[PDB]
Amino acid sequence: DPLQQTGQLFGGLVRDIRRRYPYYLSDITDAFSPQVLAAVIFIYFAALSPAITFGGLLGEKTRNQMGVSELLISTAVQGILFALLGAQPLLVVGFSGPLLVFEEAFFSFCETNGLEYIVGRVWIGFWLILLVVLVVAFEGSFLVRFISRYTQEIFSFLISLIFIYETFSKLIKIFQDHPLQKTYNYNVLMVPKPQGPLPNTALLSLVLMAGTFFFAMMLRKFKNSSYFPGKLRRVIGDFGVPISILIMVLVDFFIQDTYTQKLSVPDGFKVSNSSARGWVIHPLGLRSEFPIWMMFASALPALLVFILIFLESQITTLIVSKPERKMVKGSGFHLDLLLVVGMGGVAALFGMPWLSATTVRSVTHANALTVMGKAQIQEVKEQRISGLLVAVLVGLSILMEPILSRIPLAVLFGIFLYMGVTSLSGIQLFDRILLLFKPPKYHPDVPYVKRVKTWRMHLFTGIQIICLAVLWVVKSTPASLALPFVLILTVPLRRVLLPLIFRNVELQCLDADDA
Amino acid sequence: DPLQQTGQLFGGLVRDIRRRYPYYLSDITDAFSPQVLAAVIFIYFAALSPAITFGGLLGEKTRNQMGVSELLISTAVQGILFALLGAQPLLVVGFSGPLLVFEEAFFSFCETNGLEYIVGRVWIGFWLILLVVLVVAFEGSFLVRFISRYTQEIFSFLISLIFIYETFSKLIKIFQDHPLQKTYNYNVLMVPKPQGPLPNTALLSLVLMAGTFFFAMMLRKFKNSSYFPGKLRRVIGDFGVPISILIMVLVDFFIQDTYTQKLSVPDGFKVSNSSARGWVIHPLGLRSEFPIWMMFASALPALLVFILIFLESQITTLIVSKPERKMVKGSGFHLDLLLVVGMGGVAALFGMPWLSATTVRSVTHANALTVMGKAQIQEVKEQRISGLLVAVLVGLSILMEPILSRIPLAVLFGIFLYMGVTSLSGIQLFDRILLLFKPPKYHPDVPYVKRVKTWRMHLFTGIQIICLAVLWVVKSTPASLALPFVLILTVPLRRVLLPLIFRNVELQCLDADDA
Ligand SMILES: CCCCCCCCCCCCCCCCCC(=O)OC[C@H](COP(=O)([O-])OCC[N+](C)(C)C)OC(=O)CCCCCCCCCCCCCCCCC
Ligand SMILES: CCCCCCCCCCCCCCCCCC(=O)OC[C@H](COP(=O)([O-])OCC[N+](C)(C)C)OC(=O)CCCCCCCCCCCCCCCCC
Ligand SMILES: CC(C)CCC[C@@H](C)[C@H]1CC[C@H]2[C@@H]3CC=C4C[C@@H](OC(=O)CCC(=O)O)CC[C@]4(C)[C@H]3CC[C@]12C
Ligand SMILES: CC(C)CCC[C@@H](C)[C@H]1CC[C@H]2[C@@H]3CC=C4C[C@@H](OC(=O)CCC(=O)O)CC[C@]4(C)[C@H]3CC[C@]12C
Ligand SMILES: CC(C)CCC[C@@H](C)[C@H]1CC[C@H]2[C@@H]3CC=C4C[C@@H](OC(=O)CCC(=O)O)CC[C@]4(C)[C@H]3CC[C@]12C
Ligand SMILES: CC(C)CCC[C@@H](C)[C@H]1CC[C@H]2[C@@H]3CC=C4C[C@@H](OC(=O)CCC(=O)O)CC[C@]4(C)[C@H]3CC[C@]12C
Ligand SMILES: CC(C)CCC[C@@H](C)[C@H]1CC[C@H]2[C@@H]3CC=C4C[C@@H](OC(=O)CCC(=O)O)CC[C@]4(C)[C@H]3CC[C@]12C
Ligand SMILES: CC(C)CCC[C@@H](C)[C@H]1CC[C@H]2[C@@H]3CC=C4C[C@@H](OC(=O)CCC(=O)O)CC[C@]4(C)[C@H]3CC[C@]12C
Ligand SMILES: *[C@@H]1O[C@H](CO)[C@@H](O[C@@H]2O[C@H](CO)[C@@H](O)[C@H](O)[C@H]2NC(C)=O)[C@H](O)[C@H]1NC(C)=O
Ligand SMILES: *[C@@H]1O[C@H](CO)[C@@H](O[C@@H]2O[C@H](CO)[C@@H](O)[C@H](O)[C@H]2NC(C)=O)[C@H](O)[C@H]1NC(C)=O
Ligand SMILES: CC(C)CCC[C@@H](C)[C@H]1CC[C@H]2[C@@H]3CC=C4C[C@@H](O)CC[C@]4(C)[C@H]3CC[C@]12C
């Protein structure tokens, strides 16, 4: 087991290398599959869009101190490094909502306190490098031992729902921007974007999304059907999302007059606001002399950023490397943590955003490399090339502007809805949420359906709904940086509060290590 | 069996009455079900829309000699009479494409020959009354004996596909009328209809259609699922189309500014062009003296109209009253023919259109009254009230303008696509069309799948595709009135040409009386 404390300094880190690095020739050769390319194409669009979206939000929020150009380069470099050196290469390292919320907060703080933001982040980075080295030394990734199914399901479900809400909210904004009016203006300026409302924009975006999600779900049904020969059915099934994108990007292309929002990458590989910084950020300061109180006080925001990245990344590794998912090579919690957080700290010196192993992408990436027979899982295509290629392509996104500039965001939203829905598959919580509606006669005949009474099973599912609700309120409120700390409290709940009200026999079956 | 020649004058007609009329108290009381109301609501919109659409086409094609007001009254009166007196009340008596094509042709003829069209049709009616009485006397509905599965499947499949094509063609016309343009005019006049193109009209029509068809198909899946209690799941399942219409009619209502095409009934119960006729049509003439050569020569167009109505109605009765479908009361081919054609002839005297037992509606009506368990059919809800209520409501459609004027045609198209798709269910031809794509290992294990070799089964399916193609070309070409005569040639094909190239053992299994 990786979670056993070796008792020797960097004992986990050594064992995590000695576990996976023998299977490195396999990690390159296991990628020799069309399913692995079909994964790259899908997970590239999954990786790029947030690097464009969050990068755009970063720019307008931080006065272009950090923007799309920075985040595209960071996502690419860290993704390439992690793909090659990671103990679990199926982890997709990218920027997230919690990380955006911090960059917002640290900027807002730096403006009020009159500090260089981009220089301020360099010291957040130096602490993260010191703090991860200190944690990996003493084998602090052994505390991922204590994070049970209970916590993993609540998280995986919360992050999957947030993703679906975020996807739908982006569609609503198009209808809010381009409402269904009786009359419009046709002297409107599209200098940076449609200055005023346009006809046919919002309904076409709705159709483009719906059509993309439809074809994606139908081509998944087709994959696990008894139509057409097995090879052709599998090949077309494996390229479910790539076909769904191609079909509906072509639908958009042949519609001439009507406007849709397209993927807009930067002009070239340039810093977002040269008037505010270069590439390499000087710790002692750029314009004004950087003060000494912040150089030590940076530890507190660095400890917060560490928790955000640790919780998200380590829980993503648990969910991806579950026993039920046929992962033979095995994940290394020490090596993965050392890279993700370590690289993030080094990235801050170059004024680029630190990243995390994002759940929906990592989950989706693993799912894109999972084979199906008869239905159950035979084996997952465990390799470093899919994660590498996605990172390299995100880096090259600036150069391949002509290809991306024709692809609408409407199509991408249909793929995010598919990602959001598909990510719920192997969550026992979601499986038990469906049993609340199903009568007890037509239950799946699994242990917690058999061993535990129907009202006891639904009560346990009831506690996880109450957690998700609290987690969703904490996400909504200004205190959104405290969601990792609220997520941690699910471990006490399972270990202290549940065994009081629930019997152990029920909990062992409901919350099991294997299915 | 109803198809046995009694050998006594009106022997079939008597036996058809003596079969069903004992079960008349059941025909009233079997309707006491919410499924039967859910059938009325669905089949009312199925019955009304063509009575509006064909009625509108009749008006512009015949200079309002026959219009919507006429067809709404005819569909209502004949539907009410047939519902009460019919041997198979599940037959929905309405106007069809083949009947429109004749009214076109007879008008075009009457203009060239300088004859009173509406007066000319009165003599077509008098012959139909004489010709049906002559056929029913000598038991000519015994020739429906010779119409096998082969012919019934080709027809049922052709009429189902034409319906789907007609539904999609109506959507294309909206995009052709209201294209996706960059700029529009907003001094456009909507006096009788949008004089020029509008924004958001066509894409909303597409969404409204797609949404209606989606919910309809999902609520059918829900009906035959293991989610929510059995009664609630069945009730909501039974009201699948009524809910699907309500949801998407409300979506249209809350969209204020954007225009959609709505159901437009006439102002009141008035003749379409009083300047050209009254209610009762004088056989000897209205304006000019009606000639004697046409009074005898009317037999030829009356013989053509008879074949059109006979083939369509008698084949619809076969398809509806199959052994597979649990129809205990039994259909009467003599009584049903005597009413449909007889009423049509009497209707012509009042300058109203003669009708036929339309397949998709009749099939859909039977399907709307069919229960499902475990899945197989237990029993069909055989009653006269569903057919009666649909006819009465079509009659009242003129009075309930406020309710219909809010319902868009876009929603109705989603229900026609559902009708078109659902009508293919119990067609062995369609079942065998799917086996062309499926590998032979995953075949349904039914007699023709086992007894007959895979390439022989697919060859037989190949002959029926070639028939459908020829039937579709005959439908497209100017000679569309000859489609009944081309459909009749499938009976020789099965009886003469197939037993030459196919063995009897194969044909008996492929073309079986029961499944
Ligand atoms: C697997 C099957 C394929 C997927 C299903 C696709 C079927 C087709 C559905 C079509 C969409 C129908 C609903 C939208 C109706 C039109 C909206 C509109 O015009 O409103 C404008 C309104 C305008 O709001 P307003 O009214 O406040 O604007 C006022 C403005 N003035 C005053 C100027 C007029 O905008 C919206 O908010 C519309 C949002 C649309 C939301 C619909 C999302 C549908 C996407 C697919 C859903 C997926 C289902 C998941 C379940 C299955 C999971 C496995
Ligand atoms: C149970 C399934 C749930 C429902 C599935 C459907 C999901 C939702 C899909 C949304 C529609 C996406 C496809 C259309 C793309 C947009 C069209 C457009 O804007 O083009 C304009 C074009 C413009 O063409 P044009 O030729 O006028 O363009 C020339 C331009 N001018 C005039 C300026 C010179 O118009 C069309 O022709 C589009 C018509 C719509 C296409 C048909 C839609 C089908 C919807 C139902 C399908 C159901 C699935 C059946 C299979 C399953 C059966 C069980
Ligand atoms: C922040 C950036 C610069 C990354 C910093 C990573 C270092 C903390 C790593 C990189 C290589 C590591 C070393 C790689 C190999 C070993 C041998 C290892 O030997 C054993 O005792 C292993 C025996 C076994 O259990 O098999 C002891 C730790 C050590 C020195 C490691 C200590 C931690 C090091 C220096
Ligand atoms: C590395 C392979 C696998 C391709 C995938 C990633 C590359 C497309 C990216 C990763 C980081 C990028 C680099 C990040 C920073 C810079 C500095 C940038 O600035 C300069 O040196 C020019 C002068 C100036 O701006 O001051 C020029 C582009 C370059 C080399 C970028 C070019 C594109 C790179 C190599
Ligand atoms: C919407 C707000 C209140 C956010 C909080 C989340 C709710 C959706 C939670 C709060 C309490 C939960 C309930 C607490 C206890 C139960 C009993 C539990 O088992 C039963 O006693 C009924 C089932 C059976 O008898 O088999 C079923 C779920 C349910 C209703 C839970 C469903 C989800 C609820 C309503
Ligand atoms: C002419 C218009 C108004 C349409 C009506 C068609 C007529 C030609 C039908 C309507 C009622 C029919 C009659 C209904 C009942 C009978 C009794 C029937 O009596 C028997 O021979 C016994 C039947 C048996 O026991 O089998 C003979 C046919 C007859 C006169 C039928 C002959 C054909 C009739 C007149
Ligand atoms: C009562 C229900 C169950 C019957 C079925 C539906 C009704 C709403 C329809 C069926 C036929 C319709 C009738 C068909 C023809 C006429 C003649 C029409 O005559 C006139 O224009 C006025 C008198 C004249 O000027 O000659 C008046 C409406 C009326 C009675 C219609 C009223 C509505 C009726 C009864
Ligand atoms: C639409 C236009 C082109 C009108 C013509 C109709 C075609 C669609 C028909 C004409 C001949 C038909 C084919 C003739 C023979 C066969 C082989 C038959 O299978 C076999 O006999 C061998 C395959 C096996 O081993 O099962 C399957 C149907 C098919 C393709 C037929 C169905 C489709 C075809 C091309
Ligand atoms: C690019 O950076 C410049 C500074 O390098 C930004 O200018 C600042 O603007 C804010 C308010 O918008 C002021 O509070 C600062 O005093 C300005 N700084 C200086 C010295 O100019 C500018 O906002 C940035 N623009 C972009 C691209 O976002
Ligand atoms: C109603 O019917 C009248 C009678 O045919 C139509 O009026 C005729 O119009 C045509 C040209 O369309 C002329 O050639 C005739 O001289 C007109 N006849 C009479 C007596 O008016 C009228 O077009 C029809 N209108 C409707 C409602 O379709
Ligand atoms: C750019 C956007 C709009 C769409 C991009 C999707 C592209 C890359 C996808 C869509 C369909 C895909 C193809 C689908 C099937 C196969 C067969 C397989 O044996 C080799 C790869 C190949 C030939 C795929 C290559 C990549 C492909 C062309």
Ligand SMILES: CC(C)CCC[C@@H](C)[C@H]1CC[C@H]2[C@@H]3CC=C4C[C@@H](O)CC[C@]4(C)[C@H]3CC[C@]12C
């Ligand atoms: C007019 C158009 C837009 C929509 C018309 C559909 C109406 C008539 C339909 C939609 C949903 C239907 C209801 C659905 C379920 C039930 C429960 C059943 O036990 C009694 C009938 C009742 C209460 C139905 C009555 C008719 C109903 C209200």
